[PDB]
């Protein structure tokens, strides 16, 4: 599908999720093109954004700005709870989040559940500065379905669960509904936290409304929404749902356990991420 | 490779290898003035778009972000501003945002391209309405000039809604311009200027920060905000004060909440929290910008 | 004054105070390459339009006038041309016209902007078809360079389908360029170049003729033709031959009538009479051009 | 009607006669704006084309290029017949045509028939460069309907008739039909000639087809169509019908009687005007 372009010899990210607009990157060379039992996988060398991973036509990450997403999705939750030891990451086709999780010395075990082995393979072959994450001694890589993995999880066995989901377009829509969240809340120790990728405030204020609603129904601890700059994601921003279960209080706005050096995240950035714009703040409240 | 027809792509050397594209609903106007290529078109999902020299200048959908931030970050950081100057007509949205401040007595608007103002007045409502405020003194002419002929210390604030430092507007980023702004400002006066993106032009920004640090004896701060339609998705701002009463840009002194201008409509983007957050820079930039 | 929406206007300093406008049916593509702003749109009454750097480059409705003239004025003035070079054939129409000549064995096409070639191939059928001829050797690169590395006297004719001498293409009108063309041409070879309008740039034209007169020992002639979509409605051409067999540009030696290329379709504009007429200049220009 | 514009502060020439396109000139200042009993009249100082006359939204002339039209319409016919003495001109007038007719020494009388007095007045007041033509001793200016004047003309009393008509949009469409042409043929001396403004080959090949047809039926002498460059007229070109009546032959292609100096017209240009483009040549033939 080298047709998804609005500019000759370029790749344009298009989808019903963000109609009437598209992000395009100049393609230098296509390194990998294949189709798994789950999705279309493409890796191309961009001209100015490094290597780019594309799943079902959606940009998953680029070497130039992975840091922002990977660093925020990991530390917002991880730096908000004391001495995290066991952590679950769902769908980390990349290793970057893993690399970021492992940055926390207190961690003892990092379970990884990615359903498409092709992603892990492609990632390991073309993205070195992150595939490195799969190599940590504490990483327990599991190739299977996340909602299932979590459904079979021992109760209260995790300090944190990070859901690096994709767009709630197909089968991954399950990762945004109540059943799944209840599943996560059960797997979390009391006062444990979850960090879910929760779309853009500029594009899906409706979807975000339901997500905030479901979490507020499942989680009796804190329920917050944070957003961050990620140039390569539609609208330039991406959000996160930060939730904690019944138990010790968790203040996601003020990192209690602050941390190569970090290229994006820092204590200021951490609380800044929870300051939503008025139009969004109104609804989410 | 075959293109899908019906799309407009924002492309430029200022941001090589990448492009924001919008589905064109209908062309409202496309010409060329003595200064720039001007385009006004109906986009499919972002309302009307204004494009200058091929660079999206604004969208009805997210113009609030830029206008509100560029206007209120400086104006909410000082007490009762009365005389404010805005360089770069652009569209009048900033103008509408300045009008929210009740204390303002006079607003000088200095735009060099009348075609831009004309087309804006015609195709944009919640924008061309700014030019209508009695306090607005619209002057069509070169801004750097207008500032040179400005009475020393006669302004409480200066807002530079410039474009990219690609054309002759590169001056608006040079030291000579900032010196002119400084003298035109009362002591303790503030300036806010469009200052590119941390993701694309760290180099440039670094020079801009230096220039302002050598010209302004008050406080110098860089802020950034989300603006979906500008390249990289974020845009920067230089907030500077001249020697005199101290200015704390990080903590708004008088942030507009809503009742502040109950009749102007609520603010869609800006709020006191977003104000402080705007000054929290990511690590890679934080080190370089000090 | 209020504008009627839905129109595209061609404006330039090269022709101040005037403008040609077209009702836009639908935007087919609008972006920017490393070299220029590229626009392809469906006009209401002129079919598809290609616009480069803001200047209408061709229209389906009248491209025949430009293409046929620039191609056949030189190609019908010499016996059996075999190796022809086209510089900057941004659309491939000139190409299609060159292909009408059965004696042609090889056509070198040198276009510097691949985006143009790409967008043309996609939206312009009759035009893009040209690139398909077996004799066509398409080369994406700088034309002036391609010509410097050209074997001396290897071409029978050179067609420069340049744009306006506004950007870096101003070289294509300079003496160094013409000297390169001359060396690349066989003795008695011919060159035809777009050479602005008698109504708008007498000054420029005058310099062009001088440059040509100092470089070409053969015959130098200026011709003009009607092209409704180019500013002023007419376009000019420089027809020069190098020292060698005499070349009579005023009287076509082998004009294409129709049976000449029965299978290519009939010419929509060119013919032997129009050929001679092209060289009849109005009085105000006749004196100045000698 | 200062709305007929597609560019702020500019004048745009638009009309159903040439849909989807428009010629625009930058307006410096509007000198005259009025409405006669016949049409809307406007005179504005253009930025780069001198003063401009506009009738019913259509540019009638500009100081910068009037030479082309006025010189071609008068000399194509006048340089084709030997010793012309009596001439009739019908049309929006401006004196440019008169000024050009008066360039012929042999001429003894120039009947001028303009129906809208306002046009003559406005022309006289703002266009001294052509109001001058009204002041020649041989000019008999008649304010009235041309069709009528011509219908009352004495038989075979003119050597040449020049119809500087406007577009065949309204009441002037009559000046393009057979009755009027027979009227002209009656008023012309044997071997006499007519020169009529005959639209643009690029825009009205069909109307031009009817005109050529009609003339071909009425005139038994020569019937030729010629076109000329006129930047300010839609398409950049304008055509002319050249016809001669039964009698002494007339070779419109080769001026038998060649002539401030001329700024456009010349012998070469004269015959070049009869060389039409293939697509037009085919139909007209």
The span from the CA of D146 to the CA of D161, in Å, is 11
The span from the CA of D219 to the CA of B239, in Å, is 82
Quote the DSSP letter at residue B280.
-
Q: In what order do the strands lie in the sheet with D139-143?
A: D139-143, D109-114, D86-91, D158-164, D188-197, D237-244, D223-229
**The tokens of B88 are what?**
């770069």
Distance CA D128, CA D214 (A): 37
CA–CA distance, D89 with D161 (Å, rounded to integer): 6
Output the 3-class SS for chain D. CCCCCCCCCEEEECCCCCCCEEEEEEEEEEEEEEECCCCEEEEEEECCCCEEEEECCEEEEECCCHHHHHHHHHHHHHCCCCCCCEEEEEECCCCHHHHHHCCCCCCCEEEEEECCHHHHHHHHHHCHHHHHHHHCCCEEEEECCHHHHHHCCCCCCEEEEEEECCCCCCHHHHHHCHHHHHHHHHHEEEEEEEEEECCCCCCCHHHHHHHHHHHHHHCCCCEEEEEEECCCCHHHEEEEEEEECCCCCCCCCCCCCCCCCCCCCCHHHHHHCCCCCHHHHHHHC
Q: C58-290, superfamily in CATH?
A: Vaccinia Virus protein VP39 (3.40.50.150)
Question: Cβ of C146: how many Cβ atoms within 10 Å?
Answer: 17
**Residue B94 C-alpha from the chain's centroid:** 7
Q: What secondary structure, in 3-state letters, does B88-154 show? A: CCCCCHHHHHHCCCCCCCEEEEEECCHHHHHHHHHHCHHHHCHHHCCCEEEEECCHHHHHHCCCCCC
Query: How far is residue D75 CA from its own chain's centroid?
Result: 11
Across-strand partners of A241?
Answer: A196, A225
Angstrom CA distances, D285 to D225, D280, D282, stand at: 9, 8, 6
User: In whole angstroms, what is the distance from residue C49 CA to residue C63 CA?
Assistant: 10
Tokens at A144, concatenated: 């299977």
| Tokens coding B276 | 């402080």
Ramachandran class of C188: left when φ > 0, alpha when ψ lies in -120 to 50, beta otherwise? left
CB–CB contacts below 8 A, A to B: 148
* Residues annotated within a binding site of A for S-adenosyl 3-(methylsulfanyl)propylamine: 39, 70, 94, 114, 145-146, 164
Q: How far apart are CA A126 and CA B290, in angstroms?
A: 35
Residue of D nearest to C6 (CA): D6
CA–CA separation, D79 and D73 (whole Å): 11
Helices B202-215, B175-184: crossing angle, 10 deg rounding = 40
Distance CA C212, CA C235 (A): 18
In degrees, rounded to 5, the angle at the alpha carbon of residue A263 between the alpha carbons of residues B250 and A271 is 40
CB contact under 8 A, B232 and A235: no
Chain B nearest C-alpha distance from C4 (Å): 8
Distance separating alpha carbons of residues D171 and B129, to the nearest angstrom: 46
Give phi and psi for C221, each to the nearest 5. -140, 145
* Residues flagged as binding site of A: 39, 69-70, 94, 114, 145-146, 164-167, 233
Confirm whether C1-57 and C58-290 share one CATH topology.
Answer: no
d(CA A249, CA A246): 8
Say yes or no for a CB contact (<8 Å) between C30 and B37.
no
Tokens of B150: 């400005």
* Token digits of residue B20: 């924001």
d(CA C42, CA A184): 54
B286 contacts A46? CB cut-off 8 A: no
DSSP-derived letter for residue C151 is P
Burial C25-41 (b: 16+ CB within 10 A, else e): bebbbbbbbebbbbbbb
Residue C272: how many CB atoms within 10 A of its CB?
17
Rounded CA gap, D112 and D128, in Å?
18
State phi, psi for C206 to the nearest 5 degrees.
-55, -45
Q: Enumerate the residues of chain C whose CB falls inside 8 A of the CB of residue A26.
A: none
Cβ-based neighbours of B97, under 8 Å, separated by 6 or more:
B67, B68, B70, B71, B72, B130
Only one residue has tokens 């691949």, namely C114
Closest CA to B110 of B150, B79, B56, B76: B150
Task: Point out the catalytic residue in the list A164, A206, A249, A251.
Answer: A164
Residue C44 DSSP label: S
Q: What's the rounded Cα separation, in Å, for the pair C77 and C218?
A: 13
Torsion sign over Cα B288, B10, C53, B143: negative
Query: Which residue, chain included where needed, has tokens 């920004």?
Result: B205
- A93 phi and psi angles, rounded to 5 deg: -55, 90
How far apart are the C-alpha atoms of B67 and B186, rounded to whole Å?
Answer: 24
d(CA C261, CA C252): 17
Say whether B18 and A276 touch across the interface (CB within 8 A): no
Residue where the block lists tokens 């900057």: C88
Do C274 and D277 make contact, defined as CB atoms within 8 angstroms? yes
For residues B23 and B40, the answer to whether their CB atoms sit within 8 Å is: no
The answer to whether the CB atoms of D48 and C23 lie below 8 A apart is no
CB contact under 8 A, C19 and B31: yes
Which sign does the torsion angle of CA B10, B12, B15, B17 carry?
positive
Please tell me the distance from the alpha carbon of residue A133 to that of residue A92, in angstroms, as a whole number. 10
Question: Hey, which chains touch A, using 3+ CB pairs under 8 Å?
Answer: B, C
- Other CB atoms within 10 A of residue B254 CB: 17
The residues of C carrying an active-site annotation are 161
| CATH architecture classification, D1-60 | Roll (2.30)
The domain over range C1-57 is classified in CATH as 3.30.70.870: no
B240 CB neighbour count, 10 Å cutoff: 29
* Set of chain D residues whose Cβ sits within 8 Å of the Cβ of B31: 7
Residues 6+ apart with CB under 8 A from A213: none
Sign of CA dihedral B93, B97, B100, B106: negative
Residues of D with Cβ-Cβ distance to C3 under 8 angstroms: 5-8
The resolution of the experimental structure, rounded to one decimal in Å, is: 2.7
Is the Cβ–Cβ distance between B144 and B172 less than 8 Å?
yes
Q: Cβ separation of D268 and C286 shorter than 8 Å?
A: yes
The two tokens of residue A61 are 């990450």
Nearest CA to A269 out of A281, A248, A253, A251 is that of: A253
Helix ranges (H only) for chain A are 66-78, 96-102, 117-126, 128-131, 146-151, 178-187, 205-218, 267-272, 278-284
Among residues D282, D203, D200, D235, the alpha carbon closest in space to that of C266 is found at D282
Of B162, B193, B158, residue with least CA distance to B75 = B158
The two three-digit tokens of residue A155, written as one number: 């109760």
DSSP state of A12: E
D–C contact (≥3 CB pairs within 8 Å)?
A: yes
Flag if A23 and B19 touch (Cβ within 8 Å).
yes
Identify the CATH assignment for D61-285 out of 3.40.50.150, 3.30.470.20, 3.40.190.10, 2.102.10.10.
Answer: 3.40.50.150
Which of A14, A22, A49 lies closest to B17 in CB terms? Answer: A49
CB-CB neighbours of A246 under 10 Å: 12
D164 in active site: yes
Q: Which residue from C minimizes the CA distance to B19?
A: C31
DSSP 8-state code for residue C260: G
Q: Is C105 exposed, middle or buried (0-12, 13-18, 19+ CB in 10 A)?
A: middle
The active-site residue out of D164, D206, D210, D251 is D164
Residue C232 phi/psi, 5-degree rounding, is 80, -15
Q: Is A10 helix (H, G, I), strand (E, B) or coil?
A: strand
* Measured CA angle at C224 (ends C220, C227), to 5 deg: 150
C34: which chain B residues are within 8 Å (Cβ-Cβ)? 13
**Residue A32 phi/psi, 5° resolution?**
-145, 140
> Is the CB of residue B178 less than 8 Å from the CB of residue B143?
no
Query: CB atoms < 10 A from the CB of D157, how many?
Result: 15
- CA dihedral of D137, D143, D144, D146, whole degrees rounded to 10: 40
Cα-atom radius of gyration of chain C, to the nearest Å? Answer: 18
Give the torsion sign (CA, A112, A117, A121, A127): negative
Spatial separation of the C-alpha atoms in residues B115 and B31, rounded to whole Å: 9
CB contact under 8 A, C3 and B119: yes
Residues pairing with C164 in the sheet: none
Given a contact cutoff of 8 angstroms between Cβ atoms, the answer to whether A147 and A181 are in contact is: no
Task: Identify the CA nearest to A265 among candidates A65, A67, A64, A115.
Answer: A67
H or E element, residue A18: none
HSE-CB for C185 with a 13 A CA cutoff? 30
Gap from D261 CA to chain C (nearest CA, Å): 9
Closest Cβ opposite residue B5 in set C12, C19, C28:
C28
**Closest-CA residue in chain A for B19?**
A24
Task: Name the nearest CA neighbour of D55 among D145, D135, D139, D116.
Answer: D116
**The residue count for chain B:** 290
Contacting residues of C for B28, CB less than 8 Å apart: 5-6
Nearest CA among D69, D80, D90, D30 for reference residue D265: D69
Structure tokens at A82: 């004391």
Q: Is there a contact between A130 and A97 (Cβ–Cβ < 8 Å)?
A: no
Domain spans of chain B, in order of start:
1-57, 58-290
Among C31, C32, C38, pick the best mutation site for testing chain A contact (most A Cβ within 10 A). C31
How far does the CA of residue C40 sit from the closest CA of chain A (Å)? 12
Among B183, B106, B114, which Cα is nearest to B142's? B114
Cα-Cα-Cα-Cα dihedral sign, residues B230, B236, B241, B246: positive
Please give, rounded to a whole number of angstroms, the shortest distance from the CA of D20 to a CA of chain B: 14
Residue of chain B nearest D5, judged by CA positions: B29
Pairing of strands C185-194, C155-160: parallel
Q: Give ∠ CA C56-C59-C15 in degrees, rounded to 5.
A: 25
Put residue C238 in one of left, alpha, beta given phi > 0 → left and psi -120 to 50 → alpha: beta
**C-alpha A226: how far from chain center:** 13
The residues near B212 (Cβ < 8 Å, ≥ 6 apart) are B178, B220, B238, B240
């Amino acid at each position: 599908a080298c047709f998804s372009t609005v500019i000759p010899g370029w790749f344009s990210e298009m989808s019903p999720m963000w109609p009437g607009e598209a992000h395009s990157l100049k393609v230098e060379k296509v390194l990998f093109q294949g189709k798994s039992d789950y999705q279309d996988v493409i890796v191309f060398q961009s001209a100015t954004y490094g290597k780019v991973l594309v799943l079902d036509g959606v940009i998953q990450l680029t070497e130039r700005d992975e840091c922002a997403y990977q660093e925020m999705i990991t530390h917002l939750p991880l730096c908000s709870i004391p001495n995290p030891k066991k952590v679950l990451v769902i769908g980390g086709g990349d290793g970057g989040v893993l690399r970021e999780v492992a940055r926390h010395a207190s961690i003892e075990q990092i379970d990884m559940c990615e359903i498409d082995k092709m992603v892990v393979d492609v990632s390991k072959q073309f993205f070195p500065d992150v595939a490195i994450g799969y190599e940590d001694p504490r990483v327990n890589l599991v190739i299977g379905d996340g909602v299932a993995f979590l459904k079979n999880a021992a109760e209260g066995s995790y300090d944190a669960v990070i859901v690096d989901s994709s767009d709630p377009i197909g089968p991954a829509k399950e990762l945004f509904e109540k059943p799944f969240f209840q599943s996560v809340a059960r797997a979390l120790r009391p006062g444990g936290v979850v960090c879910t990728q929760a779309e853009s405030l500029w594009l899906h204020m409706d979807i975000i409304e339901d997500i905030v609603s479901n979490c507020r129904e499942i989680f009796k601890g804190s329920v917050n929404y944070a957003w961050t700059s990620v140039p390569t994601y539609p609208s330039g921003v991406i959000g996160f749902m930060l939730c904690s279960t019944e138990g010790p209080d968790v203040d996601f706005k003020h990192p209690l356990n602050p941390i190569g050096p970090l290229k994006f995240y820092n204590a200021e950035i951490h609380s800044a991420a929870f300051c939503l714009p008025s139009f969004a703040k109104k609804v989410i409240e």
